[PDB]
Amino acid sequence: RSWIQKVLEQIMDSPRQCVTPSEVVPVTVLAVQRYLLEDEPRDTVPKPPLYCYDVTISDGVYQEKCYLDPSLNSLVYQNILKVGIQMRISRVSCLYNEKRIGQGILCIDNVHCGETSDSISLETPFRNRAHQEKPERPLRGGKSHYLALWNNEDPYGDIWLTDKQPEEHNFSDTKIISLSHLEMTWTNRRNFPALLVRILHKSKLRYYGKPDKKMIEPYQTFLEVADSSGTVSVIMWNALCPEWYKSLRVGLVLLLQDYSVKKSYPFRIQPVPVDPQIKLISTMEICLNLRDPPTNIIII
Amino acid sequence: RSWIQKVLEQIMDSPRQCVTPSEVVPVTVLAVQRYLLEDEPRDTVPKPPLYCYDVTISDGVYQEKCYLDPSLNSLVYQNILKVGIQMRISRVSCLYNEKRIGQGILCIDNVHCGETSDSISLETPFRNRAHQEKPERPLRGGKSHYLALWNNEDPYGDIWLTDKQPEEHNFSDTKIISLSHLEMTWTNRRNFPALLVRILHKSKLRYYGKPDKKMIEPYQTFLEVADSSGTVSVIMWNALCPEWYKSLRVGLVLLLQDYSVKKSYPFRIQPVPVDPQIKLISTMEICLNLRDPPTNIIIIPEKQVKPEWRLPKLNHRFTTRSELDDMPENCICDVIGLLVFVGRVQRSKKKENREDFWSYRWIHIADGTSEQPFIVELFSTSQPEIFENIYPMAYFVCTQLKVVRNDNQVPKLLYLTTTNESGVFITGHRGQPYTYDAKVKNFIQWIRTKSDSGEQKNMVIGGYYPYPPVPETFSKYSSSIKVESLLTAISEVRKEIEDLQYREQKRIAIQGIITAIKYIPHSSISDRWESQLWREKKFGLIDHLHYSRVYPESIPRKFMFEHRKFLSDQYNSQPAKYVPPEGRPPKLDDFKSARSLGHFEVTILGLNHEIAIDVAFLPMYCPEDIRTSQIDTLLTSMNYSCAYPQDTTGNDRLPGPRAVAGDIIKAATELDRVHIVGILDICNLGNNKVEVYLHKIYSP
DNA sequence: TTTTTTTTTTTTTTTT
DSSP, rough: OOHHHHHHHTTSSBOOOBBSSSSSHHHHEEEEEEEEETTTTTTSSSSSSSSSEEEEEESSSSOOOEEEEGGGGGHHHHTOOTTTEEEEEEEEEEEEOTTSSOEEEEEEEEOOOOOOSSSSOOOOSSSGGGGSSSSSSSSSSSOOOOSSOOOSSSSSSSTSSSOOOOOOOOOSOOOOOOHHHHSSSSSOOSSOOBBBBEEEEEEEEEEOOOOSSOOSSOEEEEEEEEEEEEEEEEEEOGGGGHHHHTTOOOOOOEOOOOOOEEETTTTTTOOOSSSSSSSSSSSEEEEEOOOTTTSEEOOO | OOOHHHHHSSSSSBBOBBBBBBBBEEEEEEEEEEEEEEEEETTTOOOOOEEEEEEEEOSOEEEEEEOOOOOHHHHHHHTTSSSSSSEEEEEBBBBEEETSSOOOOOOEEOOOOOOBBBBOOTTOBSGGGGGOOSSSSOSSSOOOOOOOOSSSOOOOOOSSSSOOOOOOOTTTOOOOOHHHHHHHTTTTOOSSOOOOEEEEEEEOOOOOOOSSSOOOSSSEEEEEEEEEOOOOEEETTTTTTTHHHTTTOTOOEEEOOOEEOOOSSSSSSOOOOTTSSSOEEEEEEEOOOSSSSSSSSOOGGGOOOOOOOOOOOOOOOOOOOHHHHOOOOOOOOOEEEEEEEOOEEEEEOOOOOOEEEEEEEEEEEEOTOOSEEEEEEOOOOOHHHHHTTOOOOSSEEEEEEEEEEEEESSOOOOEEEEEETOOOOESSSOOOOSSSSSSHHHHHHHHHHHHHHOOOOEEOOOSOOSSSSSOHHHHHHHSSSSSHHHHHHHTTTHHHHHOOOOOEEEEEEEEEEEEEEEOOOOOOOEEEOHHHHHHHHTOOOOOEOOOOOOGGGOOOOOOOOGGGHHHHHHTEEEEEOOOSSSSSOOOOOSSOOOOSSEEEEEEETTTSSSEEEEEEEEOOOOOHHHHTOSSSSSTTOOTTTOOOOOOOOOOSSSOOOHHHHHHHHHHHOSSSSOOOOEEEEEEESSOEEEEEEEEEEEEO
């Protein structure tokens, strides 16, 4: 029927064993994504690559998202393994994700990348429906996500939403304080009242996901919002960035609640704003983590 | 001479200096009192432990109270440093409590806790007589106090006084305004006059003490009081709970005179009164703070109570099992019944603070109105004397029980839970505190009928009882759990086991294939099955976890009134202070096992055939349940009733334990190369005894 | 860079 089906049926019952596919049929690359290579043993002298790749090889019948053995990342560093190319898989292995309920994953272990295909079909069905889940995620890991193919400062994938719209939050009985008020009183305020800030500068994304530490969405952005005269470098943590980054533009009046206040990071460099009359509060910074109710960030 | 005195003289003139003692002879622990770790530098990268412990060692000549170095707190966390153990001190250091005038405090910087001591002499004197003072207080820090060794809601120590008896006070010249009038005029008047109220609900203690804060005995208890003109929420502030808490109880007419009325708290809710006629005051709250002349609270005796005042009467929403079957969820109720089972005192981590725990235990209260027992999740209600010493065959009465219901699962879950303002009372024979209520009289009538009829309900105590049974399909089980934490890795399991604390319970799910199940006749044709997959992959396993061991304390044991004290102590929380055992105690294997089957051992090879584990299967269902189909499958751990058999009298024809064991093994064998999802139960029984019992096998 | 929840607070004026 298809090369994908034959190899999967041949290697499904032998996880973590390398078997040359019964038949070597050229397969078209339809996608190449990059994500962190956590869960690998960092005890080997040649520390495994900091990132791994997933390639969506497509046969005539189906296309099944595979896993590229990190030892093959050289073919992607040189861009020899690109989308639209034809390659002949030479070695495969089956791996099962122990944090998800699903079928085996084809583990590409040796390829012979050729040339661009004559006919690429974007309508070939997906053999495993799990691979077709709309919030696309990497094959390995529980709550993993794909990074941008080359740089780490560019949003990529479906985790990044643009659905946020202005909301009319009534200010009937909202306790709004000034940034200077926290500056003077933030070490005694058991509860930090609401705030009404406006974005002045939005920073570029920053990925701090190391391979050994277990973190979810290690994405962090610094926003210089200024309420009244004061200005502080608010910093969004964890999975808050991929829910508000593609939506928040400079000049949006944010209403931040259920936030945290801490000491300014030692190596932080707060940028001077255009207006000099303002106060540059550089002692404390407001951290916005994802609270269970979606009231922490509301734009008016 | 004494090793204690040798070491003290050795390191008395070198404060805060780590000095290995000249000679190390084992010392005997006699107590472990916990209190808050304050006045230490918290800037350190390894944030100081939130709590520190004092260990009262003895050396045969003198017994001296020592301050364990917080770096060793893990030993107490895992219950390795018990009471009555032969620890050996490897390092010692002095320290002077500058807030007090005394001697040095022998600091145990490093220790090698060993085995139990055969000579636990609590008659030895105290080298530092200051340590042997009537109010037992911590070594370091001003007017510090001790907390309960495990939770923060259990009163502990000697500060908790219990000698407040009713006093006759003449109300002449007193105003005793109505609560509604106070609500109207508490923002204008300056001198709030007296109030005559009756306690309707008494809540558990709340410890809000934080480190490096100048707080003295930070306890607060919430009392709901009602008069003939509504009810209000009364709150007792620090330093008042210690003197009054153990004495105040529901149904006491109080005369509060010098209080402070505030705006009330929006983050705390006021419980609805049992009688709806009582108007509820929510915009007002009364705060009782300790005053110089202790007159702000007076326990007016009932004799002085005049009907003219028309004080509200303490009512109760007593419920029976049949009625509870028809009550919606979150419908508070009261239960009176006979304790036909008691479970271990397990602990759960507070969601607010990672270093605080809740002490809870399951009890099957029962009555004559139905054949199923009240399943009550009894959290600690700041009543350790009753909570810790609860035993079957006792008439038990709780005060405020919220109803909890879950109908999604095939085994419809219907268990009650204790609320913040709940209370526990053990009753004796005819209703002692609540005789008047008709339901209590009916319960007593049923008790007498059972006694004269020669019928005795089966009794059990302690054991492995994971009450909440996982649903019949893995999809419904995962409907509540997040996808990222739904499953784990057989390799990661080891860390999960090694992370638990004393009696901390955890449930995990692991993906694998059953490879070999073995039957172990527990009490006093095929019992072992091996899979060809196992015979092939057994030599290529990275790490074969071995946790298929069942401890003697995880087997529920039929209760016996004669051995009540021993049975209770074998399942309560670890005592803070040693107490010599009367005569000789029996063997924990000397009691009949309430279970009716032998435990199996299940081997699970992960999906990748690299890692393996050996869990232990401990079903609690009897063959009658199998015959009547009260079990979803033979690989589950509980029947639908979630209760032990009562007066088993129908096993003459039913298949015996061996037949059911063979059926279980065959059912396991049906799953040869099927990716199953086991559900394990990880409970640490202290002293590095972690039980990992299988709960359910979700097949595709 | 990561990082969550909890409460604590006492006191000498008005008369029209």
